[PDB]
Structures are given as structure tokens and as C-alpha cells.
Amino acid sequence: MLKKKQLTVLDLHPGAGKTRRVLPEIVREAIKTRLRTVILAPTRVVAAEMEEALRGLPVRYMTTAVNVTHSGTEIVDLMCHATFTSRLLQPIRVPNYNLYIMDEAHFTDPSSIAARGYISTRVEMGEAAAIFMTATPPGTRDAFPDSNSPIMDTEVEVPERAWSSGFDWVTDYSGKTVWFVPSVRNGNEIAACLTKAGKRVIQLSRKTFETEFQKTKHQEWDFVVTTDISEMGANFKADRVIDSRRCLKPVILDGERVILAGPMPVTHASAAQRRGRIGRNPNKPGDEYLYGGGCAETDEDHAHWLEARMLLDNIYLQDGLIASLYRPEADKVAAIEGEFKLRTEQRKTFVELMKRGDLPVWLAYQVASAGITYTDRRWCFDGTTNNTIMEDSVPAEVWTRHGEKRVLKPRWMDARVCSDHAALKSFKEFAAGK
RNA sequence: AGAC
């Protein structure tokens, strides 16, 4: 019933064939019933996996993650969640899709949350149908979904720093382990400890994934030590997961600044994705998930919820209507719809700051709502002293567009612009006008 | 930390 103007949530457990089996079945039916359809992948890596499953079916890939020959007659488009939301913020022709399919519809990136709000609103207006696919539908707080094989779940004291004794079960194990850590720095410490104990370790994060993930498929390894990059798009031939049950997330303090808070407890959805790396083979019983604490009861602290509202308040629907967040996650923010709707010129600035500046949503919003123009970078240098950005333990400096060397000290502090080397490099280029 |  794809023509029915309703939202279907497909709760598809890890390993149940969401991409390899269910998605092609949906897409074939959409094509046969001549429905203009958009497929929303959470990441480039997942978009490339979808192309393998959809090979032969006529799909227009709107991502450079895939390069196949298009016929020009395709009625099914595929793009990443954030591409979709970005396109909604531009004064562009928003195509009139009859059917929206979102894979990994638990994803709490602010563009993903915004996309679900836009899509569910369109469905509630009678304008479209949608399908949301995930192991953990928004609203559901279960960390232990079904699996292809039974998983032994055991809560234990999980080491979170290098250890010299007291965790023998970690290194006495004869199988292969995927270990989820909150940060790159924390994983480097655990990995070094394991390597000293004689184990073969591969480390995964956003920065290293392209090169290192392939090694997990082609080299022998004992441990994969990974951030939450491996919650989506990543599968392993493993027998055990060790889970800190911790992550780092951006949090807005006092409405005034953003910190990268934590390590803090992961959500149920993320814990389910982490556990879901094992128990995948019905012919390989006995896989184990060893976890270190509870999941987050509260989630409303994360900045992504307010950021999603900032995006949605600035996406034009016909006649200036504003979309709501998807209902099961609408209570995660306490703001009235339209609070963050910017007037025309400031809205253009906000959009440009995000798309060309690569600024976080919250930061882009502060600058745009201040009346600052996109190209005026004075604000990067005129904050209070406690906003001075440090690099190698001394104040970071930039050569500006005006040929002066100035200390980086932004008027609004968002820790995401300087929390790793790539982010700081980008923000320095921004501050320089380059 | 993740993301286009």
C-alpha cells in the first residue's frame, strides 16, 4: 500500500536485511506503481552499500559516493540525509516525491532529525507516503533487539583506561572483539594497552575509516577499537563486542556556548547498533555483548534537538507553514515552532555559514541572528578571553584577510570548531577568509 | 563524537 498517504515504521533488527532484501523490494514496487521516490541514506558509506543492493534497478544517485551511468528516465532518487535537508534550505525546486524512504531512521544527526520532521509533516498533511527503517524506532527504548543468533548479554566492569591487571577476561579471550569507545584519544589509550599485551589492533574513527576499515576485511586482527562511526555502515566477522556505553555529544550550556560533553551514557538506539555488530550468523552461536553501564534515561540535553528545530524553522513549506519534529521525538525540545525562523536576509546568511562555512548549526544561527554578513569574519577574533582557542597548548593564531596575525577568539564558543585537528584547520581557514 |  505505497500509494496510501501514511508513515510506516519498519522495525528491522540488526542483520534482518534492511538494505540487502527489504529496500530493493520496496524500490521495485515503487517503480512498478510509478511513484516518484527518494531513498535517504544516513552516510556516504551506507549510500554505496545501497547501490550494491539496488544494482540494475533504475536509481539516480545524487551523491558522489556512487558513480554509475544514469539513463535520465529514473523516478527514484538516492541521497544522504543531510543532502536532503540542505537542499530543503536552498531556494531550489524541492521535487514533489510521492514516497520518502529513510534508512537508519534513528539517526540523531540534526539534519536527520529535521528530515524526519519535514517528511512526517508532509505525510500528516496528506501529501506523501513514507517508510522509516531502523532497529530502534524513535520512541522505543530497547537496547536489546532481536538478532540472527542469540546473544549473551552481560554487564561487567569495562576498563576505560590502560590497565596492568584486573581485567583478564579481556585478553584471555580467543575470538575477535569489536570495542566501542567514546573518543579517538580514549581508543588510542586502550589500543596501545592491547598492542603491548600482544594483540593485533585496528582503530576506527571518522578520520581513519576510509583506510582502516578495509584492513578489517583483509588482515588478521584480534581487536577493532572504534568510535561510534561503526554504529552504521560497518560490519565485522566478530564473536564479541565490548561496549563502554559511552559517547561524546555536543551540549548547549546555559543557552550561551556549546561543549563537546562526556563521556556520557549512550542512548538505547546507539547501544542497540553497537551490540548489533555480533549475533549475526545463525550458524555461529555463542556471541557475547559485554557492557559497562546503563543507557541514557535523559536525552534532551543534546544540542542536536534544538539544532534540528533551527533547521526546520527555516525550511519553507507552502505559505510559510513550519514543519513539526516527528511526533515521538517532538518532546525532546521545549521551543515553540517558529522561534528560530529568521527573516529573509539573515536566513540566507545562516544557510551559507553552514553550507560554505561548514559551521555547526547552533554557531551559524548565533552569527546570522546577530545580523553579521557571511563574509565578515571580525567575530572570530573579538570574543571574551575565555573563548580563546588553543592549539598545542598555546593560543591559536590566524593570518587574516587584512594581513594581520590575530589570536582566534570567537564571539560565540562552539567546541566543535576546535575539538580535533581537522575541525580547527577548517575553522582557521574560515577565520582567515580562505 | 558524528555528518553532508
Short mmCIF file of C-alpha atoms (C1' of nucleotides) in Angstrom, two decimals:
data_model
loop_
_atom_site.label_atom_id
_atom_site.label_comp_id
_atom_site.label_asym_id
_atom_site.label_seq_id
_atom_site.Cartn_x
_atom_site.Cartn_y
_atom_site.Cartn_z
CA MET A 1 0.00 0.00 0.00
CA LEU A 2 2.72 2.53 -1.07
CA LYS A 3 0.17 4.93 -2.56
CA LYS A 4 -1.52 5.30 0.85
CA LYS A 5 -0.60 8.67 2.39
CA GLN A 6 0.74 7.27 5.66
CA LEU A 7 4.00 6.63 7.56
CA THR A 8 5.11 3.04 8.05
CA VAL A 9 7.84 2.31 10.57
CA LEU A 10 9.67 -0.91 9.77
CA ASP A 11 11.36 -2.09 12.94
CA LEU A 12 14.03 -4.24 11.30
CA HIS A 13 16.52 -5.79 13.67
CA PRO A 14 20.23 -5.73 13.00
CA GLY A 15 21.06 -8.44 10.39
CA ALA A 16 17.49 -8.72 9.12
CA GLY A 17 18.40 -7.45 5.60
CA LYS A 18 17.08 -3.85 5.70
CA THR A 19 19.36 -2.86 2.79
CA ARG A 20 20.04 -6.20 1.03
CA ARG A 21 16.45 -7.51 1.00
CA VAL A 22 13.79 -5.05 2.14
CA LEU A 23 14.94 -1.91 0.36
CA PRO A 24 15.10 -3.47 -3.15
CA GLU A 25 11.65 -4.98 -2.62
CA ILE A 26 10.24 -1.52 -1.76
CA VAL A 27 12.05 0.18 -4.65
CA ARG A 28 10.84 -2.39 -7.24
CA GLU A 29 7.27 -1.87 -6.10
CA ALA A 30 7.64 1.93 -6.21
CA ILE A 31 8.98 1.78 -9.75
CA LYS A 32 6.10 -0.51 -10.87
CA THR A 33 3.47 1.76 -9.34
CA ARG A 34 5.23 4.81 -10.93
CA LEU A 35 5.82 6.63 -7.65
CA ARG A 36 8.44 9.35 -7.55
CA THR A 37 10.63 8.19 -4.69
CA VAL A 38 13.61 9.39 -2.69
CA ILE A 39 15.81 6.98 -0.73
CA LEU A 40 17.64 8.64 2.20
CA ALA A 41 20.92 7.06 3.29
CA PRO A 42 22.44 8.25 6.55
CA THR A 43 26.02 8.32 5.22
CA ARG A 44 28.03 8.01 2.04
CA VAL A 45 29.24 4.60 3.18
CA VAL A 46 25.66 3.36 3.50
CA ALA A 47 24.73 5.01 0.13
CA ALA A 48 27.47 2.92 -1.56
CA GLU A 49 26.13 -0.24 0.15
CA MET A 50 22.66 0.59 -1.13
CA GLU A 51 23.91 0.79 -4.68
CA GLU A 52 25.21 -2.79 -4.42
CA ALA A 53 21.76 -3.95 -3.28
CA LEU A 54 19.93 -1.84 -5.95
CA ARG A 55 22.25 -2.70 -8.83
CA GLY A 56 20.39 -2.88 -12.11
CA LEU A 57 17.26 -1.08 -10.75
CA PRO A 58 16.95 2.44 -12.21
CA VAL A 59 18.09 4.82 -9.41
CA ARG A 60 19.51 8.32 -9.81
CA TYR A 61 22.36 8.58 -7.29
CA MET A 62 22.64 12.15 -6.00
CA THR A 63 25.89 11.55 -4.14
CA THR A 64 29.48 11.33 -5.40
CA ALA A 65 29.77 8.18 -3.19
CA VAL A 66 28.37 6.28 -6.21
CA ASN A 67 29.33 6.62 -9.91
CA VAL A 68 27.09 4.69 -12.25
CA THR A 69 25.62 5.58 -15.59
CA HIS A 70 22.15 7.17 -15.34
CA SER A 71 19.55 6.73 -18.09
CA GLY A 72 17.86 10.07 -17.37
CA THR A 73 14.48 8.34 -17.04
CA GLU A 74 14.84 7.37 -13.38
CA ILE A 75 11.98 8.26 -11.00
CA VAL A 76 13.85 7.03 -7.87
CA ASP A 77 16.49 9.36 -6.39
CA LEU A 78 19.00 8.44 -3.65
CA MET A 79 20.84 10.95 -1.43
CA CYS A 80 22.17 11.30 2.08
CA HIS A 81 20.00 12.54 4.92
CA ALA A 82 21.99 15.77 5.21
CA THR A 83 21.90 16.42 1.45
CA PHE A 84 18.13 16.25 1.55
CA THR A 85 17.90 18.76 4.43
CA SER A 86 20.47 21.03 2.80
CA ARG A 87 18.52 21.06 -0.44
CA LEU A 88 15.34 21.94 1.52
CA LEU A 89 17.11 25.04 2.89
CA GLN A 90 18.05 26.34 -0.63
CA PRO A 91 15.62 28.34 -2.89
CA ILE A 92 15.62 25.29 -5.23
CA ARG A 93 12.90 23.14 -6.80
CA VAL A 94 12.02 20.73 -3.99
CA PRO A 95 10.81 17.75 -6.05
CA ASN A 96 7.37 16.50 -5.20
CA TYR A 97 8.19 12.97 -4.03
CA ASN A 98 5.27 10.65 -3.57
CA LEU A 99 7.28 8.31 -1.33
CA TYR A 100 10.12 9.01 1.12
CA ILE A 101 12.24 6.07 2.33
CA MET A 102 14.58 6.76 5.24
CA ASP A 103 17.15 4.15 6.22
CA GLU A 104 18.54 4.31 9.77
CA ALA A 105 15.69 6.50 10.88
CA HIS A 106 17.02 6.52 14.47
CA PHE A 107 20.00 8.71 13.43
CA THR A 108 20.27 11.77 15.69
CA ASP A 109 22.32 13.98 13.42
CA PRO A 110 20.37 17.32 13.41
CA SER A 111 19.82 17.13 9.63
CA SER A 112 18.39 13.61 10.04
CA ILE A 113 16.02 14.69 12.85
CA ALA A 114 14.99 17.69 10.67
CA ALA A 115 14.38 15.45 7.66
CA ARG A 116 12.11 13.18 9.71
CA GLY A 117 10.14 16.25 10.88
CA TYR A 118 9.73 17.54 7.32
CA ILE A 119 8.74 14.09 5.95
CA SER A 120 6.34 13.19 8.78
CA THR A 121 4.70 16.64 8.46
CA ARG A 122 4.15 16.12 4.74
CA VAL A 123 2.59 12.76 5.48
CA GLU A 124 0.29 14.30 8.18
CA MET A 125 -0.72 16.92 5.60
CA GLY A 126 -1.82 14.09 3.22
CA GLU A 127 0.86 14.94 0.69
CA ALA A 128 3.05 11.83 0.62
CA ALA A 129 3.77 8.41 1.98
CA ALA A 130 6.89 7.49 3.94
CA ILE A 131 8.78 4.47 5.26
CA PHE A 132 11.21 4.75 8.21
CA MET A 133 13.55 1.74 8.67
CA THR A 134 15.65 1.09 11.79
CA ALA A 135 16.36 -1.39 14.54
CA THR A 136 15.19 1.17 17.10
CA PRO A 137 12.26 3.39 16.07
CA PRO A 138 12.18 6.83 17.67
CA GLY A 139 10.12 6.50 20.84
CA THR A 140 11.24 2.95 21.58
CA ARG A 141 13.78 2.45 24.43
CA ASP A 142 15.06 -1.09 23.94
CA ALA A 143 18.84 -1.67 23.82
CA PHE A 144 18.49 -5.40 23.10
CA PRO A 145 16.70 -6.01 19.75
CA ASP A 146 16.38 -9.36 18.02
CA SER A 147 19.38 -10.91 16.30
CA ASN A 148 20.05 -13.69 13.77
CA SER A 149 21.67 -15.73 16.59
CA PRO A 150 21.10 -15.46 20.38
CA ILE A 151 23.49 -13.03 22.10
CA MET A 152 24.78 -13.47 25.64
CA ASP A 153 24.39 -10.01 27.26
CA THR A 154 26.47 -9.42 30.39
CA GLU A 155 27.01 -6.24 32.33
CA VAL A 156 30.59 -6.01 33.60
CA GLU A 157 33.21 -3.53 34.75
CA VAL A 158 34.63 -2.46 31.40
CA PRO A 159 38.11 -0.88 31.54
CA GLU A 160 38.16 2.65 30.18
CA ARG A 161 41.87 3.41 30.67
CA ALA A 162 45.06 1.38 30.13
CA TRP A 163 45.26 -1.41 32.75
CA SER A 164 48.05 -3.65 34.06
CA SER A 165 45.79 -6.13 35.87
CA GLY A 166 42.25 -6.83 36.96
CA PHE A 167 40.61 -7.42 33.51
CA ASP A 168 41.99 -10.81 32.50
CA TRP A 169 38.78 -11.70 30.62
CA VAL A 170 39.66 -9.03 28.05
CA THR A 171 42.93 -10.57 26.86
CA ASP A 172 42.29 -14.29 27.74
CA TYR A 173 39.57 -14.48 25.08
CA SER A 174 40.40 -16.49 21.94
CA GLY A 175 37.96 -14.84 19.43
CA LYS A 176 37.61 -11.46 17.70
CA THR A 177 36.36 -8.36 19.54
CA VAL A 178 34.83 -5.04 18.48
CA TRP A 179 35.27 -2.47 21.27
CA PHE A 180 33.28 0.79 21.25
CA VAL A 181 34.94 3.80 22.88
CA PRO A 182 33.76 7.43 23.25
CA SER A 183 36.71 9.21 21.63
CA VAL A 184 39.77 8.82 19.48
CA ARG A 185 42.10 9.73 22.41
CA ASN A 186 40.44 7.14 24.63
CA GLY A 187 40.65 4.48 21.92
CA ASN A 188 44.34 5.28 21.32
CA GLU A 189 44.99 4.50 25.02
CA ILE A 190 43.08 1.20 25.02
CA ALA A 191 44.59 0.17 21.68
CA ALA A 192 48.15 0.89 22.94
CA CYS A 193 47.45 -1.25 26.02
CA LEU A 194 46.16 -4.12 23.93
CA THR A 195 49.05 -3.87 21.47
CA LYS A 196 51.53 -4.04 24.41
CA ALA A 197 49.75 -7.23 25.58
CA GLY A 198 50.48 -8.78 22.16
CA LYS A 199 47.18 -8.24 20.37
CA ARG A 200 46.67 -7.12 16.77
CA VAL A 201 44.52 -3.98 16.86
CA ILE A 202 42.88 -1.85 14.18
CA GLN A 203 41.41 1.54 15.20
CA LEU A 204 38.44 3.16 13.51
CA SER A 205 37.14 6.71 13.61
CA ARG A 206 35.81 9.20 11.03
CA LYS A 207 39.38 10.38 10.39
CA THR A 208 40.75 6.86 9.74
CA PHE A 209 37.77 4.89 8.45
CA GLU A 210 38.44 5.02 4.72
CA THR A 211 41.89 3.47 5.06
CA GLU A 212 41.46 1.32 8.19
CA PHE A 213 38.04 -0.24 7.65
CA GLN A 214 39.33 -2.09 4.58
CA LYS A 215 42.05 -3.60 6.75
CA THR A 216 39.36 -5.23 8.96
CA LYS A 217 38.27 -7.18 5.87
CA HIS A 218 41.75 -8.10 4.60
CA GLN A 219 44.14 -8.57 7.57
CA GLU A 220 44.02 -10.76 10.66
CA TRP A 221 43.04 -8.85 13.75
CA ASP A 222 42.21 -9.55 17.37
CA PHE A 223 40.50 -6.25 18.33
CA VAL A 224 38.79 -3.45 16.47
CA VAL A 225 38.78 -0.37 18.72
CA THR A 226 36.20 2.01 17.24
CA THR A 227 34.20 5.14 17.89
CA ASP A 228 30.52 5.30 17.06
CA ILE A 229 31.43 5.62 13.36
CA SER A 230 30.85 1.84 13.33
CA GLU A 231 27.26 2.08 14.51
CA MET A 232 26.22 2.39 10.86
CA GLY A 233 27.69 1.14 7.59
CA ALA A 234 30.18 -1.25 9.27
CA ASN A 235 30.12 -5.00 9.67
CA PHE A 236 32.71 -7.33 11.07
CA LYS A 237 33.35 -11.06 11.41
CA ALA A 238 33.47 -10.99 15.19
CA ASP A 239 32.42 -13.01 18.22
CA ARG A 240 32.36 -10.38 20.98
CA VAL A 241 31.54 -6.71 21.47
CA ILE A 242 32.88 -4.78 24.42
CA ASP A 243 30.85 -1.62 24.98
CA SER A 244 31.81 1.25 27.27
CA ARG A 245 28.30 2.51 26.63
CA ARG A 246 29.79 5.99 26.46
CA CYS A 247 29.91 8.70 23.82
CA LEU A 248 30.75 12.40 23.40
CA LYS A 249 27.95 14.67 22.26
CA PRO A 250 27.55 18.43 21.78
CA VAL A 251 25.55 20.12 24.55
CA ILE A 252 24.44 23.77 24.79
CA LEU A 253 25.37 25.26 28.21
CA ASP A 254 23.07 27.98 29.55
CA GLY A 255 21.90 28.85 26.01
CA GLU A 256 25.28 30.56 25.57
CA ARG A 257 28.01 28.13 24.38
CA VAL A 258 28.45 24.58 23.05
CA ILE A 259 30.66 21.97 24.65
CA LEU A 260 31.56 18.53 23.48
CA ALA A 261 30.22 16.87 26.62
CA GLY A 262 31.06 13.49 28.08
CA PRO A 263 31.99 10.74 28.11
CA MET A 264 28.31 10.23 28.90
CA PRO A 265 25.90 7.31 28.55
CA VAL A 266 24.79 6.33 25.05
CA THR A 267 21.17 6.17 24.01
CA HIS A 268 19.22 2.91 23.66
CA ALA A 269 19.34 3.22 19.91
CA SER A 270 23.13 3.56 19.84
CA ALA A 271 23.68 0.70 22.30
CA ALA A 272 21.46 -1.46 20.05
CA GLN A 273 23.56 -0.57 16.99
CA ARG A 274 26.79 -1.37 18.90
CA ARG A 275 25.54 -4.75 20.16
CA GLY A 276 24.15 -5.44 16.66
CA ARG A 277 27.64 -5.94 15.31
CA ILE A 278 27.51 -9.51 16.73
CA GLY A 279 24.97 -12.33 16.84
CA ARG A 280 24.73 -12.01 13.05
CA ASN A 281 25.35 -15.62 11.96
CA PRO A 282 22.71 -18.24 12.84
CA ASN A 283 25.38 -20.94 12.37
CA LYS A 284 27.75 -19.26 14.85
CA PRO A 285 26.14 -19.39 18.27
CA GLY A 286 27.65 -18.02 21.45
CA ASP A 287 28.45 -14.39 20.55
CA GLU A 288 28.77 -12.08 23.56
CA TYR A 289 27.97 -8.43 24.33
CA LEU A 290 29.84 -7.16 27.42
CA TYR A 291 28.69 -3.72 28.53
CA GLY A 292 29.79 -1.26 31.13
CA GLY A 293 26.73 0.62 32.36
CA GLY A 294 23.20 1.84 31.54
CA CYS A 295 21.85 3.79 28.62
CA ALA A 296 20.86 7.45 28.89
CA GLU A 297 17.45 7.86 30.56
CA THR A 298 17.51 11.58 29.53
CA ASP A 299 18.45 12.75 26.06
CA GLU A 300 17.10 16.27 25.81
CA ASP A 301 20.46 17.77 26.77
CA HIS A 302 21.97 17.00 23.37
CA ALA A 303 22.34 20.12 21.09
CA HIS A 304 21.11 18.17 18.03
CA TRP A 305 17.48 18.51 19.07
CA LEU A 306 17.50 22.32 19.21
CA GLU A 307 19.68 22.41 16.03
CA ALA A 308 17.02 20.32 14.24
CA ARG A 309 14.43 22.93 15.22
CA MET A 310 16.72 25.72 13.95
CA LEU A 311 16.84 23.90 10.59
CA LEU A 312 13.13 23.16 10.44
CA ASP A 313 12.09 26.65 11.43
CA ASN A 314 13.93 27.88 8.31
CA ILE A 315 12.67 25.33 5.76
CA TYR A 316 9.90 26.82 3.65
CA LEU A 317 6.71 24.88 3.35
CA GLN A 318 3.98 26.34 1.16
CA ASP A 319 2.59 29.62 2.64
CA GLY A 320 5.17 29.91 5.36
CA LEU A 321 3.89 26.91 7.36
CA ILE A 322 6.55 25.31 9.60
CA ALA A 323 7.09 21.60 9.99
CA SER A 324 6.99 19.87 13.34
CA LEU A 325 9.51 17.34 14.57
CA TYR A 326 8.46 13.72 14.09
CA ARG A 327 5.92 13.19 16.92
CA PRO A 328 7.78 10.57 19.02
CA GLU A 329 10.79 12.91 19.29
CA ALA A 330 8.88 16.24 19.34
CA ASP A 331 9.02 16.46 23.17
CA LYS A 332 12.87 16.38 23.13
CA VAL A 333 12.92 20.17 22.67
CA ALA A 334 10.95 22.76 24.64
CA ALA A 335 10.87 25.51 21.94
CA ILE A 336 7.70 26.86 20.17
CA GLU A 337 7.54 26.17 16.38
CA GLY A 338 8.95 29.23 14.59
CA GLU A 339 11.03 30.64 17.42
CA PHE A 340 14.13 30.32 15.27
CA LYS A 341 12.55 31.40 11.96
CA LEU A 342 14.87 34.02 10.52
CA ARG A 343 13.88 36.89 8.25
CA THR A 344 14.91 36.58 4.65
CA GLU A 345 18.41 38.04 4.63
CA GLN A 346 19.51 36.53 7.96
CA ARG A 347 18.17 33.14 6.80
CA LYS A 348 20.34 33.31 3.66
CA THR A 349 23.36 34.05 5.91
CA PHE A 350 22.58 31.10 8.21
CA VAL A 351 22.35 28.73 5.25
CA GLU A 352 25.62 30.00 3.73
CA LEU A 353 27.50 29.73 7.02
CA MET A 354 26.54 26.05 7.28
CA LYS A 355 26.96 25.01 3.62
CA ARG A 356 30.07 27.05 2.66
CA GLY A 357 31.45 27.82 6.12
CA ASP A 358 30.87 24.27 7.47
CA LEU A 359 29.88 25.85 10.76
CA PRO A 360 27.76 23.84 13.18
CA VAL A 361 24.08 24.70 13.07
CA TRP A 362 23.99 26.37 16.52
CA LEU A 363 27.01 28.56 15.70
CA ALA A 364 25.72 29.54 12.25
CA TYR A 365 22.48 30.56 13.91
CA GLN A 366 24.18 32.84 16.51
CA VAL A 367 26.17 34.63 13.81
CA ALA A 368 23.26 35.01 11.36
CA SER A 369 20.83 36.16 14.07
CA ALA A 370 23.38 38.81 15.12
CA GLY A 371 23.00 40.47 11.69
CA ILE A 372 26.59 39.60 10.68
CA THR A 373 27.17 39.02 6.96
CA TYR A 374 28.67 35.73 5.75
CA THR A 375 31.99 37.25 4.62
CA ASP A 376 32.57 39.44 7.74
CA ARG A 377 34.86 37.36 9.96
CA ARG A 378 35.53 40.00 12.65
CA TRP A 379 33.52 37.95 15.13
CA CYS A 380 36.14 35.22 15.02
CA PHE A 381 38.56 37.49 16.93
CA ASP A 382 36.57 39.70 19.28
CA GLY A 383 35.14 37.37 21.91
CA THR A 384 35.86 37.28 25.64
CA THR A 385 39.22 35.87 26.81
CA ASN A 386 37.75 32.59 27.96
CA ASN A 387 36.79 31.95 24.29
CA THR A 388 40.46 31.91 23.15
CA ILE A 389 41.09 28.82 21.05
CA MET A 390 44.24 26.82 21.96
CA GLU A 391 46.43 24.73 19.68
CA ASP A 392 49.43 22.74 21.05
CA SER A 393 48.67 24.32 24.45
CA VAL A 394 49.11 27.99 23.30
CA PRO A 395 46.71 30.47 21.69
CA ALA A 396 45.86 29.64 18.06
CA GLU A 397 46.70 32.37 15.57
CA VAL A 398 45.49 33.17 12.09
CA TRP A 399 46.69 35.45 9.29
CA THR A 400 43.56 37.37 8.38
CA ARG A 401 42.26 38.68 5.12
CA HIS A 402 43.63 42.10 6.21
CA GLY A 403 47.21 40.86 6.63
CA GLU A 404 47.23 40.78 10.41
CA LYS A 405 48.11 37.86 12.60
CA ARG A 406 45.44 37.56 15.29
CA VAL A 407 44.54 35.23 18.11
CA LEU A 408 41.48 33.11 17.40
CA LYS A 409 38.86 34.16 19.96
CA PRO A 410 35.32 33.83 18.62
CA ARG A 411 32.41 35.85 19.96
CA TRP A 412 30.41 32.62 20.36
CA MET A 413 32.18 29.48 21.56
CA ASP A 414 31.22 26.16 19.95
CA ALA A 415 33.75 23.48 20.90
CA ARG A 416 33.08 21.62 17.65
CA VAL A 417 35.13 24.13 15.66
CA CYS A 418 38.29 23.11 17.57
CA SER A 419 37.78 19.68 19.14
CA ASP A 420 40.03 17.86 16.62
CA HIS A 421 42.77 18.91 14.16
CA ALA A 422 40.55 18.76 11.04
CA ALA A 423 37.86 20.93 12.65
CA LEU A 424 40.39 23.56 13.83
CA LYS A 425 42.13 23.65 10.43
CA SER A 426 38.78 24.29 8.76
CA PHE A 427 37.83 26.99 11.30
CA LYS A 428 41.21 28.70 10.87
CA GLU A 429 40.63 28.86 7.10
CA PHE A 430 37.18 30.30 7.74
CA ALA A 431 38.53 32.92 10.14
CA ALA A 432 41.16 33.88 7.52
CA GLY A 433 38.53 34.29 4.77
CA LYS A 434 40.22 31.43 2.78
"C1'" A B 1 31.97 12.49 18.78
"C1'" G B 2 29.34 12.23 14.22
"C1'" A B 3 27.62 14.30 9.33
"C1'" C B 4 26.85 16.28 4.18
#
